[PDB]
């Protein structure tokens, strides 16, 4: 066929050529040696990869059977002893501190937003990489953070009343963040630098900063600067001065904009936010990841670092780019980009580590300017969907082997651990320990975690509704426990403690109001879906001193094993019939809305309107939750298969309507069983209870491959 033979492997030609012609040159790795390494690593580690997956299934079968033989509110003591007997719940290791070294300041020290985007989308990826600095005025004027009340609405052209509120909001932020010795930024008439100090002119007098150490730099003439640079909680704030701009001309000090350092780090995602089901899809992804690391990805282009004058008069530079992670896929899936002699597909996680690692070498050297990514010499890989410490140890050993193939020093490849599976949650300390010399973050992937919570306890009884899950005891303990485990392993000053994604892309007023809870909880980072959201979330890190919060949480134990293990079962007679229908409609709409873009267009993340037409930006995990929740309700007789059918039928034309204005869209209604997308949605629900750990990829990949093959002829 069209495959290349390397030992026991048969590699898709498009992948082979991409790696030879694009990825390898410039790395000084012998191509022959790389490919022999691919074959050897695959041969050596494939058996334990499979053994790990079989172990998952064996644990789940035992738990399924534990619930099925029980009639009695759970006896927690018994349930725990049981989880311990079967090896689900492992002993907690002794106290230790992580030793991870060679890590950039953005990760060890800086608290701020972390932006996650689909690596298949070059535009979004480039915009994300450039999102290290963002316009606060654009983010305020462009969103509902400033209410679109009467008089202040957005029109075809600039609205002065709204622009003045934007200005006012920012002046208030400045007062909160970098206070003057007296007076307010609201009344400033000019900025100058005198004797290395910022001098702010007010109408009656002049003043300096209450804390002059927050003055970081400036641009232009000291006596008439074009910008002033400030710093607060490790994050930079830049005031752009330009009275001959449309906004500056209206401004009392001629201020044009306030630029915030926003997306400090970015995760280029090969997993839940993309649809990649074969060699062609992987290659598009890998090529974008290459372009980012070489610095030559073009839609526009990547930003250079930013030049400043130091307060005393010297020159310095700040990074213009978000420091990049890459999120590889997890342990489950195989991909036909490589098959062995028997025709069996190779594990995709093993592939990603080899290829994303190889590609990452370019980000460690000069872009044909300075090197794009890690100055300290690390490669930052996020590893999702791991269950427990043996799976973390496997990932570390995988990275160890790749480092040898690639000629990198041991521990170059760092690991961002997603805590998004129950067996990792209740063994978190051991998971950190297994990666104690590689770990650069832990992060509560709460959506996947919810899916796994449902599947794990599928046989226990009917679960609460989807929108109820976020406030359940188990998840709130899970969030606290994650922070506690990180801090106790010495993450403060060493590694990020991260929390999850804000998915409501149009609800920015709400994000600003509520997401402050995450750095208040000691999270040094949290996820956002867009550069705009990164800029707004940045506000929270100026309001909250994360380093102090973490110092104050030290030694505390806020969650017990019992709370972590509290299954979210619905109480007796929880729902009226209309509330049941509403939940069914909600979940069917969520599934259909997501799956139609996934199967038909190969889109894994996008702005999808929900049932109430709220715009959501979720990844594949939302599908895992909804499919598992409906499977769980069907399993326990809350709804019937005809209820499911009827809701899918009702929701499909609505999804069809919601996708008007999509050039390539093809309706699901009314020819339902003509639509592969529709059949996928149905299959995800009806086979949901039988998917390993509730995972949606096996069905989703098959259906997308089916769609591609039909579209070919
Ligand atoms: O937050 C998550 C969690 N993943 O484990 N992923 C994500 C990535 C891009 C847009 C929306 C989402 Br939710
Ligand atoms: Mg996830
Ligand atoms: Mg409920
Ligand atoms: Mg402070």
Three-state secondary structure readout of 211-237: CHHHEEEEEEECCEEEEEEEEECCEEE
Q: How many A from CA of 617 to the centre of ligand 1?
A: 8
Beta bridge partners of 527: 114
The answer to whether the beta carbons of residues 151 and 346 sit under 8 Å apart is no
Q: In what order do the strands lie in the sheet with 197-201?
A: 190-194, 197-201, 206-207
For residue 616, what are the contacts with CB-CB under 8 A and spacing of at least 6? 503, 504, 505, 607, 608, 609, 610, 622
The string over 540-557, giving b where at least 16 C-beta atoms fall within 10 Å of a residue's C-beta and e elsewhere, is bbbebbbbebbeebeeee
CA distance 466 to 591: 13
Asked if 204 and 329 sit in the same domain, the reply is no
DSSP state of 209: B
CA angle 476, 446, 419 (to 5 degrees): 95
The answer to whether the beta carbons of residues 436 and 99 sit under 8 Å apart is yes
Asked if 345 and 241 sit in the same domain, the reply is no
Phi first, then psi, for residue 656 (nearest 5°) are -60, -50
CATH of the domain at 72: 3.20.20.360
Structural domain ending residue among the three candidates 210, 231, 261: 261
Residue pointed to by tokens 């509403």? 582
The answer to whether the beta carbons of residues 561 and 426 sit under 8 Å apart is yes
CA distance 450 to 441: 20
Beta bridge partners of 416: 382, 441
Structural domain ending residue among the three candidates 261, 293, 313: 261
Asked if 577 and 691 sit in the same domain, the reply is yes
The answer to whether the beta carbons of residues 464 and 568 sit under 8 Å apart is yes
Q: Which ligand 1 atom is nearest residue 605's CA?
A: 10
The answer to whether the beta carbons of residues 107 and 495 sit under 8 Å apart is yes
Nearest CA owner, ligand 1 atom 1: 501
CA distance 229 to 541: 17
CA distance 403 to 397: 10
The string over 655-673, giving b where at least 16 C-beta atoms fall within 10 Å of a residue's C-beta and e elsewhere, is bbebbeeeeebebbbeebe
Q: Which one, of 52, 43, 39, lies nearest residue 434 by Cα?
A: 52
Asked if 83 and 170 sit in the same domain, the reply is no
Asked if 246 and 137 sit in the same domain, the reply is yes
Q: Which one, of 594, 603, 619, lies nearest residue 684 by Cα?
A: 594
Q: Where do the H-state alpha helices sit in 489-560?
A: 508-514, 517-520, 531-543, 546-553
For strands 206-207 and 197-201, give the pairing: antiparallel
CA distance 30 to 25: 9
Cβ-based neighbour number of residue 578 at 10 Å: 8
CA distance 94 to 564: 20
Asked if 612 and 532 sit in the same domain, the reply is no
For residue 454, what are the contacts with CB-CB under 8 A and spacing of at least 6? 463, 568, 625, 628, 629, 632, 694
Continuous segment of H or E residues that includes residue 306: strand 306-309
Nearest CA owner, ligand 1 atom 11: 618
Q: How many A from CA of 420 to the centre of ligand 2?
A: 6
Q: Where do the H-state alpha helices sit in 544-696?
A: 546-553, 561-564, 577-601, 621-635, 641-658, 676-686
Catalytic residue among 327, 465, 494, 597: 327
Q: Which two tokens stand for residue 125?
A: 């990826």
Q: Which of helix, strand or coil describes residue 208? A: coil
Annotated catalytic residue 175 = no
The answer to whether the beta carbons of residues 448 and 527 sit under 8 Å apart is no
Residue pointed to by tokens 């044909």? 368
Q: Which two tokens stand for residue 319?
A: 């990074």
Q: Which one, of 361, 383, 387, lies nearest residue 374 by Cα?
A: 361
Q: Which one, of 542, 500, 552, lies nearest residue 522 by Cα?
A: 552
What's the burial of 576, exposed, middle or buried (CB within 10 Å: 0-12/13-18/19+)?
A: exposed
Whole-number Cα distances in Å, 475 to 36, 191, 551, 635: 45, 48, 23, 23
Residue pointed to by tokens 């990949």? 701
Q: Which one, of 353, 322, 320, lies nearest residue 238 by Cα?
A: 320
Catalytic residue among 39, 448, 619, 656: 619
Asked if 182 and 242 sit in the same domain, the reply is yes
Structural domain ending residue among the three candidates 542, 570, 598: 570
Tally of helices (H runs) and strands (E runs) in the chain: 24, 24
Asked if 57 and 177 sit in the same domain, the reply is no
Domain count for the chain = 3
Q: Which of helix, strand or coil describes residue 577? A: helix
Range of the domain at 247: 133-261
The answer to whether the beta carbons of residues 442 and 485 sit under 8 Å apart is yes
Asked if 272 and 257 sit in the same domain, the reply is no
Residues near ligand 1 (Cβ within 6 A): 116, 269, 272-273, 384, 418, 420, 445, 447-448, 500-501, 503, 527, 529, 605, 617-619, 621
The answer to whether the beta carbons of residues 620 and 276 sit under 8 Å apart is no
Asked if 591 and 609 sit in the same domain, the reply is yes
The residue to mutate among 263, 382, 605, having the most atoms of ligand 1 within 8 angstroms of its beta carbon, is: 605
Nearest CA owner, ligand 1 atom 13: 618
CA distance 361 to 34: 13
For residue 377, what are the contacts with CB-CB under 8 A and spacing of at least 6? 102, 364, 409, 412
Asked if 411 and 552 sit in the same domain, the reply is yes
Q: How many A from CA of 96 to the centre of ligand 1?
A: 30
CATH of the domain at 619: 1.20.1220.12
Annotated catalytic residue 327 = yes
The answer to whether the beta carbons of residues 414 and 439 sit under 8 Å apart is yes
DSSP state of 156: S
Beta bridge partners of 236: 231
Q: Where do the H-state alpha helices sit in 568-620?
A: 577-601
The alpha carbon of residue 636 and the mean position of all alpha carbons in its chain are separated, in whole angstroms, by: 33
Structure-determination approach: X-ray
Q: Which ligand 1 atom is nearest residue 118's CA?
A: 9
Asked if 155 and 122 sit in the same domain, the reply is no
Q: How many A from CA of 569 to the centre of ligand 1?
A: 25
CA distance 112 to 500: 13
Beta bridge partners of 414: 380
What is the signed CA dihedral for 126, 128, 131, 137, rounded to 10 degrees? 100
Residue pointed to by tokens 């149905």? 682
Whole-number Cα distances in Å, 268 to 19, 261, 294, 319, 331: 19, 19, 14, 18, 18
| Torsion over CA: 547, 548, 551, 553 (sign) | negative
Cβ-based neighbour number of residue 310 at 10 Å: 14
Ligand nearest to the CA of 232: 4
For strands 525-528 and 379-383, give the pairing: unpaired
Residue pointed to by tokens 């060699």? 279
For residue 458, what are the contacts with CB-CB under 8 A and spacing of at least 6? 64, 628, 631, 632, 635, 689, 694
């Amino acid at each position: 066929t069209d495959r290349v033979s390397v030992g026991n492997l048969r590699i898709a030609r498009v992948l082979y050529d991409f790696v030879n012609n694009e990825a390898l040159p410039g790395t000084d790795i012998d191509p022959d040696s790389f490919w022999a390494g691919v074959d050897k690593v695959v041969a050596d580690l494939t058996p334990q990869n499979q053994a790990l997956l079989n172990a998952r299934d064996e644990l789940q079968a035992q738990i399924d059977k534990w619930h099925r033989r029980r009639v009695i509110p759970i006896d927690m003591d018994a349930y725990r002893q049981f989880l311990t007997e079967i090896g689900y719940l492992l002993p907690e290791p002794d106290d230790f501190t992580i030793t991870t070294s060679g890590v950039d300041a953005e990760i060890t020290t800086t608290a701020g937003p972390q932006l996650v985007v689909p690596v298949l989308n070059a535009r979004f990826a480039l915009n994300a990489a450039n999102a290290r600095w963002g316009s606060l005025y654009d983010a305020l004027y462009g969103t509902d953070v400033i209410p679109e009340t009467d008089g202040a609405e957005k029109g075809p052209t600039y609205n002065k009343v709204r622009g003045d509120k934007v200005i006012a909001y920012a002046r208030k932020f400045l007062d909160d963040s970098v206070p003057l010795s007296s007076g307010s930024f609201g009344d400033a008439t000019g900025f100058t630098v005198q004797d290395g100090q910022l001098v702010v002119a007010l109408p009656d007098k002049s003043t300096g900063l209450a804390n002059p150490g927050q003055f970081a730099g400036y641009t232009g003439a000291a006596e008439s600067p074009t910008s002033v640079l400030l710093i607060n909680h490790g994050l930079h704030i830049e005031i752009l001065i330009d009275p001959e701009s449309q906004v500056g001309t209206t401004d009392r000090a001629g201020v044009k904009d306030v630029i915030l350092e926003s997306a400090i780090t970015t995760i280029m995602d090969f997993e839940d936010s993309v649809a990649a089901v074969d060699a062609a899809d992987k290659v598009l992804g890998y090529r974008n990841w290459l372009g980012l690391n070489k610095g030559d990805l073009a839609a526009r282009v990547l930003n250079r670092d930013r030049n400043y004058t130091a307060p005393g008069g010297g020159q310095f530079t700040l990074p213009g780019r978000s420091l990049m992670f890459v999120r590889n896929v997890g342990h489950l899936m195989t991909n036909d980009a490589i098959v062995d002699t028997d025709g069996s597909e190779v594990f995709e996680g093993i592939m990603d580590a080899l290829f994303t690692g190889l590609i990452a070498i370019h980000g460690l050297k000069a872009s044909d300017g300075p090197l794009i990514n890690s100055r300290t010499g690390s490669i930052y890989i996020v590893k999702p969907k791991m269950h427990g410490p043996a799976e973390v140890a496997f990932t570390c050993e995988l990275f160890s082997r790749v480092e040898d193939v690639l000629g990198l020093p041991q521990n170059t490849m760092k690991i961002g651990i997603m805590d998004e599976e129950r067996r990792t949650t209740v063994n978190l300390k051991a998971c950190i320990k297994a990666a104690a010399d590689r770990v650069v973050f832990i992060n509560t992937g709460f959506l996947d975690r919810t899916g796994d919570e449902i599947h794990t306890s599928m046989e226990a009884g009917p679960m609460v509704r989807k929108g109820t899950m976020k406030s359940q005891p188990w998840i709130l303990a899970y969030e606290d426990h994650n922070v506690d485990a990180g801090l106790a392993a010495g993450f403060s000053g060493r590694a990020q403690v991260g929390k999850g994604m804000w998915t409501m892309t149009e609800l920015m007023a709400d994000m600003v109001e509520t997401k402050i809870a995450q750095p208040r909880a000691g999270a040094s980072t949290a996820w956002v879906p867009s550069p705009t959201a990164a800029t707004l979330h940045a506000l929270h890190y100026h309001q909250v001193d994360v380093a102090a919060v973490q110092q104050g949480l030290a030694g505390k134990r806020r969650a017990t094993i019992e709370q972590l293990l509290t299954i979210p079962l619905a109480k007796e007679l929880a729902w009226a019939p209309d509330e049941i229908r509403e939940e069914v409609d909600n979940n069917c709409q969520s599934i259909l809305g997501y799956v139609v873009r996934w199967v038909d267009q190969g889109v894994g993340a996008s702005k999808v309107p929900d049932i109430h037409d709220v715009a959501l930006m979720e990844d594949r995990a939302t599908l895992r939750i909804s499919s598992q929740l409906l499977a769980n309700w069907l399993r326990h007789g809350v709804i019937t298969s005809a209820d499911v059918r009827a809701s899918l039928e009702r929701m499909a034309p609505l999804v069809d309507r919601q996708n008007a204005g999509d050039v390539a869209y093809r309706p699901m209604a009314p020819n339902f069983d003509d639509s592969i997308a529709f059949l996928a949605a149905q299959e995800l629900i009806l086979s949901g209870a039988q998917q390993p750990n509730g995972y949606t990829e096996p069905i989703l990949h098959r259906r997308r491959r089916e769609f591609k093959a039909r579209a070919a002829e």
